[PDB]
Design a protein around this ligand. Structure first.
Ligand SMILES: Nc1ncnc2c1ncn2[C@@H]1O[C@H](COP(=O)(O)OP(=O)(O)OC[C@H]2O[C@@H](O)[C@H](O)[C@@H]2O)[C@@H](O)[C@H]1O
Ligand SMILES: [Zn+2]
Ligand SMILES: [Zn+2]
Length: 227
């Protein structure tokens, strides 16, 4: 993985003279100096260095870009803050654990045509790593194992494989704060809704749900997991 300054040099093409149009990262004119210049320090990147992104052609202070990148885990990918194009292979802060998958013949509410896939995520507590909020300090993992259900049809089996890619790229979980329990520095769901109940009366996260499959299949396209 290249260095943070080099990551921004890739997937970027410097602008000769920046327009009057604003940089949406620092809310300052691209013509002027980055608004994060006072707290961000590069080697090869100035404060009036500006390029637009390779494919999506959105322009920012390359220092802002760098300021952004650096606030996250530094996997060598970069996400356009305007249109969210992924540059490289986005990955994420998911702690070590296991993903088991099972199938059973019983159908789910709304999918009586087919069988059911059981996904079991088991993730132990540990010590936060460099990518996590407070490196070195412990993190908790609440509620594991967490059982998840997919209709065993064509889409459901597709989403299954896409979720195996998500796991590989440490995308399904993250260390952070729980919206449910308010507890901090802990393993929580990250951006990819999972059905944890067959019967949606129990918790609110179950079946039937017509559009779940369509929702998640785009919820992980938003993290760069596609065909
Ligand atoms: N029970 C749930 N099942 C699936 N997704 C859930 C659940 N509760 C919340 N979510 C989704 O998880 C995301 C973040 O919610 P958090 O509460 O921060 O995540 P987490 O604390 O892991 O979720 C609560 C989890 O803890 C367990 O005690 C509980 O049974 C559930 O699986 C949001 O997308 C939210 O909609
Ligand atoms: Zn800026
Ligand atoms: Zn863009």
């Amino acid at each position: 993985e290249p260095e943070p300054e080099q990551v921004i040099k890739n997937y970027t093409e410097e602008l000769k003279v920046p327009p009057d149009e604003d940089c949406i990262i620092c809310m300052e004119k691209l013509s002027t100096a980055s608004g994060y210049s006072d707290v961000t320090d590069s080697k090869a990147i100035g404060s009036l260095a500006v390029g637009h992104l390779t494919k999506c052609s959105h322009a920012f202070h390359l220092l802002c870009l760098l300021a952004m990148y650096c606030n996250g885990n530094k996997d060598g990918s970069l996400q356009c803050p305007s249109c969210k194009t992924i540059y490289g292979e986005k990955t994420g802060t998911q702690p070590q654990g296991k993903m088991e998958v099972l199938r059973f013949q019983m159908s789910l509410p709304g999918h009586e045509d087919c069988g059911t896939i059981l996904i079991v995520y088991s993730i132990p507590h540990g010590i936060q790593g460099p990518e996590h909020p407070n490196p070195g300090k412990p993190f908790t993992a609440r509620g594991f194992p967490r059982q998840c259900y997919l209709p065993d049809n064509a889409q459901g089996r597709k989403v299954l494989e896409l979720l195996k890619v998500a796991w590989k790229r440490r995308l399904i979980f993250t260390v952070g704060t729980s919206s449910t329990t308010g507890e901090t520095d802990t393993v929580v769901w990250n951006e990819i809704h999972h059905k944890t109940e067959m019967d949606r009366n129990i918790t609110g996260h179950g079946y039937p749900d017509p559009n779940y499959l369509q929702n998640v299949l785009a919820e992980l396209a938003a993290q760069g997991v596609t065909e």
